[PDB]
Amino acid sequence: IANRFTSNIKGLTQAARNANDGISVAQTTEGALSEINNNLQRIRELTVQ
């Protein structure tokens, strides 16, 4: 049972690290998207003009 607990603990810690990496991916993509949205807003303003 101690061996099983050790396996579970190590697996869960590594899974937490993987989840942190996923959050990083989402942050980067969302930053790029924000820049794209700013560009689109400026394009719409120019079109209205």
């Binding site: 990083s24 942050q27 980067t28 930053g31 790029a32 924000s34 820049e35 700013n38 560009n39």
Partner: protein
């Protein structure tokens, strides 16, 4: 060889001014896109760090 008075001076001056204005507009557009690139680079650098 000697010449004569220009037939249509104001039209030529207008054409020169128009060319200058087109160059200025293109330069301003390039500078705006460069500033947007700077902002995107800063955001991506922060996220990757």
């Amino acid at each position: 060889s000697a010449g004569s008075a220009t037939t249509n001076p104001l039209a030529a001056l207008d054409d020169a001014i128009s060319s200058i204005d087109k160059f200025r507009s293109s330069l301003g557009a390039i500078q705006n896109r460069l500033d947007s690139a700077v902002t995107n680079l800063n955001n991506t650098t922060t996220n990757l760090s």
